[PDB]
Subunit: 251 residues, 4 copies
């Protein structure tokens, strides 16, 4: 597979997981669907598994800039493909957020008119939480960064544990096992930071929310310190830590 | 296997998935069962997986006219079997809707008498939603068609991705993975159009609802433009788009 | 394996599935646990899968008199083992119901004193529904028998479909797939008759409920026609129909 | 693998399952997350499966002192590694409880101030139930011990049933099947004693709760007889019984 073919697969794979994840959150927020914390988390994980199954044979199904950087540093992934892979991942998440917004277009405006929410204000951040993740009100930037580092380290460590020959896990079952890992992470740590674990999953839809009319509050989240840095660099630091720990303690 | 044997398998396979899907919706609506959006979606998906496991060895387990048309256009499926397969699929969905109605017969009339609902009126469309799918009140024909096209394209693309040699997915695990894909599609996009994704799944029970006493509102759904066209031609267009995209970008 | 060894495995396997199924129903009824229809059904199915995994290698993991009779009539199962297998299955369900009652002993009496329920009365049938299945108030004996026949036919047909060489289903994955089939059956048809599908699962705990103090209402269920016949002979008729249909239409 | 390498794997594996299990309970209690009994149980089980997948190749993934003792007595596990394995398991559960407390630090104090709960009192035992298990108010020490013995015997018996060559279960699917077994055990027996089934899972976080400020009530649980003995010796007795029963009746 050429570089162009793998970039398209990364674009489609990241878009597919964003389409399922944002869609279910949109259904809970503006469509009146009844979802619990476990149900939302299991939709995110299974959507990732389907995205991996679709694009594993072409590009390896990274679908995460943090995973792409960690693989380059620790799994001898080609450095020439690092930038195009990351660009394709963010582009796929951005376009998928636009597609979900288009399908839920009439419900978003009906929700705003009913609750008298003006887009771009602090009170509109909750609606902006459909696309991207925002921290719990009781935690700050430092605690939010620690949560993102820890959960991404677990994800990176288990990905290496589930995708190494000799561990007994079939290659056909590994994508499903990865999705279940994301579900329990989101179920146990989601109410804190939104279990982003993916710079593309957060930055992409955040750019669309800024263009959709939410303005600066899409990036800052109503906080003095702009929150968008936590899902951007937090997973990157955590992925490196998780990959380093696995090679030292398990691998 | 002869053509008659495959048609019977398609009749039973489509009926089995309708029996599980309509039954769970009936339990939520007239039996007082507590179901969320994810729970309803996961029953639909797992019911499809069981139907595929039962009939895969005989007819290939299409169980969807949109999939049958897409396979004929892109997977060299025999054209002589296209019409009998589609006829058997719609017949199976029709008979299964009648069977579910017979088992839930006393609960349907008790529900109508309690809520003073006259069958065949606009207020009875919600009860008619047990058998077939109807759009969200905030979306119209054009947006409903777009939703059905997109979700069927994802289903068709993943079906080809999950049923090709060399992708590493075992043949015994593919039917279960297909069902999980339907669950997340229904969880993320269900509150919009009912995630029909299957012309037989919608048209079949719709004909029974018309015969059961709902009349013309079973097809139109209380809309000026008859809604039944969206689940009829929407999945067909989406399946072709999804199959074409997979061959160009992934396959 | 000798006959004594297989009878012990059938005794333990049926007891294990009753222990999980009755325990979760007891938690919902007297322990205040929050369970939906899907959640209860998925506990029953997964408990059956664990029971099959434990006893498949010894006795074949029938754990159902209806399945045992159907296998003898259609799968050349030994007739000399039919009676001891059925006796062991009912004995295992009876003892497991007693064990669950012992663990939940203090909660059952606290529930009765709080709600002023006298054991053995018509108002105590709901508490007796913890151990065995009772019909929906809007359905009668004839409709209850039809529901039990249909769902057991689907279970028997899929069991043959999931346990035949050449269908591509691994032997290690078949028990889990069987449990998921039970979950969707209970989710879609449970609110009607309790998805017994197993004469031992119902008759066994019913005998214990009669001995525990519920008296005659444990068998009759407060109905003029004794309801206990429906889960006794209903699954037996359905299992034969399902096995016959599979051999004629699929097998 | 040397003894030091296996001890680290046991430390990380037990910590990983505690991180997921305590985190989801913390989200339900202090973060306002909506969780049912099945949802909490399925997070515990799947977290165990991920922990097994990470550490099976190094130390065998015991992650339970009761399992370690049972394997030494019945599976010829090395006696020299029994003490270091148990020490590592309790250490991992202790550190993971501290990590979860640190991430949820601000939410715990906000919950206490809102409800006017003084740490170390009887009314604070419910908050202490986030880390460790405490019995249902209607059951006493004797019934709590019986529940822990029975459920651990089932877990030990199924673990031997799922990890023996010749049973047809793939080695890659066994960890997932073990997690599903824990989910149904917690769903059916959790509202009684908290389905500890693991001396490290309970004693470890209990020591942290005592150090975190809960004092003596973390061990006694507000009972005249200290409850901490039930999850300590209960699973050990049950694991031996379950292993002995499997070798006599199934193995």
């Amino acid at each position: 597979s050429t570089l162009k073919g793998q970039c398209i697969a990364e674009f489609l794979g990241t878009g597919l997981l964003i389409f399922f994840g944002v869609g279910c959150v949109a259904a809970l927020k503006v469509a009146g669907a009844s979802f619990g914390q476990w149900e939302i988390s299991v939709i995110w994980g299974l959507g990732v598994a389907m995205a991996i199954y679709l694009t594993a044979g072409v590009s390896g199904a990274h679908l995460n800039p943090a995973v792409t950087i960690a693989l380059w540093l620790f799994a001898c992934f080609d450095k020439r493909k690092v930038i195009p892979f990351i660009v394709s991942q963010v582009a796929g998440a951005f376009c998928a957020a636009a597609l979900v917004y288009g399908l839920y277009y009439n419900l978003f405006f009906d929700f705003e008119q009913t609750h008298h929410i003006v887009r771009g204000s602090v009170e509109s951040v909750d609606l902006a939480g459909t696309f991207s993740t925002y921290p719990n009100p009781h935690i700050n930037f430092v605690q939010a960064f620690a949560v993102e580092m820890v959960i991404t380290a677990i994800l990176m460590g288990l990905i290496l544990a589930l995708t190494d020959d000799g561990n007994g896990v079939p290659r056909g079952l590994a994508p499903l096992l990865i999705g279940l890992l994301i579900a329990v992470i989101g179920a146990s740590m989601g109410p804190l930071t939104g279990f982003a674990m993916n710079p593309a999953r957060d930055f992409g839809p955040k750019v669309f929310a800024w263009l959709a009319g939410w303005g600066n509050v899409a990036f800052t989240g109503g906080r003095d310190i702009p929150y968008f840095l936590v899902p951007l660099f937090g997973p990157i630091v955590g992925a490196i830590v998780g990959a380093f720990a696995y090679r030292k303690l398990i691998g």
